Amino acid sequence: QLQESGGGLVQPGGSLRLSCASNYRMGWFRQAPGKEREFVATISQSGAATAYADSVKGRFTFSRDNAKNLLYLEMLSLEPEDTAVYYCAASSRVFYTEVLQTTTGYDYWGQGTQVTVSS
Structure with missing residues (x-):
């Protein structure tokens, strides 16, 4: 069962720290107005390996704490185009492949947290 939090409203250049409750x-995915749901980031079971969408790489950091059943997404240097509902998702796939950068790669989904970056 997945539930996102930490969304909110920031000005451009601001930051947020999302969380999702082995x-x-x-x-993480995001869905912006008038756009298909977009891959944001993926993380391995152990938490030691990540991959990021080009649109966020260099600004976002995805981590997990298995003992606490928690995920975190640090989002820096936000811009208006980062506005979207952000969703956490769980995949049972054992090995990494490019399918993990698509919605198809995942089994379970949270309902989302709204992120708004003002114009």
């Missing part, structure tokens, strides 16, 4: 790879 056998599953985990992912």
